[PDB]
Amino acid sequence: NASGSAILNVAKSRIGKQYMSGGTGPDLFDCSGLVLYSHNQCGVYGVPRVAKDQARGGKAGSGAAGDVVYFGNPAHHVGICCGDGSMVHAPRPGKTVCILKIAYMKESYGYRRYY
Known part of the structure; x- marks a missing residue:
């Protein structure tokens, strides 16, 4: 899907940007701020x-490019699906925006879709 790919491309564009609690871009991000941006x-x-809240909104996703992956219920972390088992995410204070295999979080996860 084109909108999905677009959301992914915007997320990818932020790879290397620093983590900041409360960040929604364009230069500093928390996990949900990257999604929102x-x-x-x-x-x-x-x-x-x-x-x-991002884990509860939109409709059910499949993990396609641009879907939101969330971790936990209530969710404490999110990223943007690449569509290949990995995500773009703002990991935690002291890391930068990067791609990570979703399985490496070693916790419960699901997908939402907002496009």
Whole structure:
């Protein structure tokens, strides 16, 4: 899907940007801020601000490019699916935005779709 790929491309564009609690871009990100930025930049409105709400909004996803992957219920972490088992995410204070295999989180996860 083209909108999905667009959200992914915006997320990828932020690879290397520093983590900051409260960051939604363009230069500093928390996990849910990266998600929010990536959608907003593509005109995909309606995405909530924090991880726990992003996990509950939109519709069920499949893990295709641009879907939101969330971790836990209530969710404490999110990323943007690459569509290949990996995600773009803002990991934690002291890391930068990067790609990580979703399985490496070693915890419960699901997918939402906002496009």
